[PDB]
Enzyme design. Structure first.
Site, short mmCIF file in Angstrom:
data_model
loop_
_atom_site.label_atom_id
_atom_site.label_comp_id
_atom_site.label_asym_id
_atom_site.label_seq_id
_atom_site.Cartn_x
_atom_site.Cartn_y
_atom_site.Cartn_z
NE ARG C 22 50.18 -13.31 -33.85
CZ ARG C 22 49.61 -13.75 -34.98
NH1 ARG C 22 50.37 -14.11 -36.02
NH2 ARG C 22 48.28 -13.83 -35.07
CD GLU C 59 38.47 -24.61 -41.56
OE1 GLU C 59 37.38 -23.99 -41.33
OE2 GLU C 59 39.61 -24.10 -41.44
CD1 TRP C 81 43.02 -25.12 -40.49
CD2 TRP C 81 45.17 -24.73 -39.93
NE1 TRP C 81 43.04 -24.58 -39.22
CE2 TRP C 81 44.33 -24.33 -38.85
CE3 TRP C 81 46.56 -24.57 -39.80
CZ2 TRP C 81 44.85 -23.79 -37.66
CZ3 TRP C 81 47.07 -24.03 -38.61
CH2 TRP C 81 46.21 -23.64 -37.56
CE1 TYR C 91 38.98 -21.57 -33.54
CE2 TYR C 91 41.28 -21.94 -32.69
CZ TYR C 91 40.15 -21.07 -32.95
OH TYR C 91 40.19 -19.70 -32.64
NE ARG C 131 18.04 -18.91 -22.02
CZ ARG C 131 16.99 -19.33 -22.78
NH1 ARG C 131 17.12 -20.32 -23.66
NH2 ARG C 131 15.77 -18.74 -22.66
NE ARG C 132 24.94 -24.55 -16.55
CZ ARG C 132 24.43 -25.22 -15.53
NH1 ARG C 132 24.73 -24.81 -14.32
NH2 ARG C 132 23.66 -26.29 -15.73
CB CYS C 151 39.18 -19.21 -25.21
SG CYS C 151 37.72 -18.18 -25.28
CG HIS C 152 41.22 -17.20 -31.25
ND1 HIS C 152 40.49 -17.68 -32.31
CD2 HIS C 152 41.52 -15.91 -31.55
CE1 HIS C 152 40.43 -16.75 -33.25
NE2 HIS C 152 41.04 -15.66 -32.81
NE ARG C 171 43.01 -14.22 -28.93
CZ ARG C 171 43.77 -15.16 -28.37
NH1 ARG C 171 43.45 -15.58 -27.16
NH2 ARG C 171 44.91 -15.59 -28.98
N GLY C 173 39.14 -10.62 -35.45
CA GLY C 173 38.55 -11.19 -36.66
C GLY C 173 39.17 -10.39 -37.83
CG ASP C 174 41.21 -11.22 -42.23
OD1 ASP C 174 41.68 -12.07 -42.97
OD2 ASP C 174 41.02 -10.04 -42.61
CB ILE C 213 40.19 -4.10 -43.10
CG1 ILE C 213 38.68 -4.39 -42.92
CG2 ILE C 213 40.61 -4.01 -44.67
CD1 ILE C 213 37.79 -3.18 -43.46
CE1 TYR C 214 44.82 -9.89 -41.82
CE2 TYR C 214 46.78 -8.53 -41.33
CZ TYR C 214 45.94 -9.60 -41.03
OH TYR C 214 46.26 -10.39 -39.95
#
Lengths: 4, 267, 267, 4
Positions: C22, C59, C81, C91, C131-132, C151-152, C171, C173-174, C213-214
């Site tokens: 983004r 963290e 952060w 979070y 399983r919830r 959600c993320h 959703r 991942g780096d 991957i950057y």
């Protein structure tokens, strides 16, 4: 996650 | 291809731990699985047993309608799924009216709730790079249970190079009866959305939390495991369709499907 | 083990498609990945580069506190952060006060929102077969964006034979900087909850939607790929702790960690 | 899926  | 599903079944037979579902019925269970099915010039309708493609197609169109009327599905020649036929806020109602208060099967929900499905399609058209393209569904029995219950399944869509992929994550999957049918239903949903948005289908990825096989399905699945997969069929879409609500069963034709025989699994 | 992470990096280098995030920064991206790390008498702190275990531990304790104060973390000797240090409903606040309206970093949120984390622990103690058992987190930037945003990330917990497993689904991942750190942070969360509930840790499963991957990380990751993993360390918990809020950094000791050198990746 |  949560109440639809 | 289909060898993933067969390898997963074999893995649960070999390593699954006995565990009972909420009704007490025995299963073998493992946690965490994933498989990837190509949608590119082929359609993953499994061939080691005949999958009920008519049920897949009719039930998905019925979800898309947002119907909560069991009659509207059964009358199509399909069984699968406080008045008669009223199913309450089932998955399709949630897809089209997310967050609306449910009253009646014959009520007018026009413009109520979030139309998650249209939103997914609108987001693919306005920003195909977005990685928040996600729709979610809850088991209705959880809704009055607690505040903010968790979802039962979520679909994340993804676009690269004019190809649309979908990852379905379900917290619990019945590997014997539910998974082959869902592979087909979400694969078909991905073909529909890719058609609507002018993209080609890429991959369907199916990810499970608890993946289980019912004890009474073990002997049939052992036999299904001895069967050689055949090449997958193709899915043709027979006309130009512009709005997800405009699809009809007659728009679709499966080609070259050549399964081994139907396997009955006790419900 | 760690060969999964290395195989995934290699796969993205070989098959990833160029795609911009983004902010416009180039990445290589694929869709749908999953790996499984044993937690049984070992701890998956990756060894092909030194992972910042002190940052991981401090963290996570800070998330558990439900803090929205950046100062409360940085002062621990950790960077990672509309007033200073106020991060908004990050979070950890969501984990402990899900659904509460956010006002101030120094406000009293006592008994407001759903304590998802305590709920997960209470559900494991009251019904480990459920399983919830799922907790979810949203990127704060999505919250005012639209109604009912998705959600993320979500964590689903699972118990069989007195062992606790966790599957983290994110959703996006780096793979270079974020994934090794998250493997360690959720693995450590699973050890904490298993300690609290009297269970042994089983598996951490990490599932991604978009895995990227950057571009500026490619040359360092190519070099990390030439390094031989060493056996994972162990994590010891140094006293009996009864409530998730009662853990302190001093309760934990990593043993036998023998990584290859730190790799710098541009933030 | 939805507003936390």
């Amino acid at each position: 996650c949560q109440l639809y | 291809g289909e060898l993933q599903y067969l390898g997963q079944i074999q893995h649960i037979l070999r390593c699954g731990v006995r565990a009972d579902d909420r009704t007490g019925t025995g299963t073998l269970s493992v946690f965490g699985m994933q498989a990837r099915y190509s949608l590119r010039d082929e359609f993953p309708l499994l061939t080691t047993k005949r999958v009920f493609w008519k049920g897949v197609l009719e039930e998905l169109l019925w979800f898309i309608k947002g119907s909560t009327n069991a009659k509207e599905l059964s009358s199509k020649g399909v069984k699968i799924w406080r008045e008669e036929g009223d199913l309450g806020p089932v998955y399709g109602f949630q897809w089209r009216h997310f967050g609306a208060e449910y009253r009646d099967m014959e009520s007018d929900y026009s413009g109520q709730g979030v139309d998650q499905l249209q939103r997914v399609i609108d987001t693919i058209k306005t920003n195909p790079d977005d990685r928040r393209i996600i729709m979610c569904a809850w088991n209705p029995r959880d809704l009055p249970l607690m505040a903010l219950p968790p979802c039962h399944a979520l679909c994340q869509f993804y676009v690269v190079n004019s190809e649309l992929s979908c990852q379905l994550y379900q917290r619990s999957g019945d590997m014997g009866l539910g998974v082959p049918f869902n592979i087909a239903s979400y694969a078909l949903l991905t073909y529909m959305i890719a058609h609507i948005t002018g993209l080609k289908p890429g991959d369907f990825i199916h990810t499970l939390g608890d993946a289980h096989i019912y004890l009474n399905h073990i002997e049939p699945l052992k036999i299904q495991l001895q069967r050689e997969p055949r090449p997958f069929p193709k899915l043709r879409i027979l006309r130009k369709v512009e709005k997800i609500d405009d699809f009809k069963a007659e728009d679709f034709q499966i080609e070259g499907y050549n399964p081994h025989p139907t396997i009955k699994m006790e419900m």
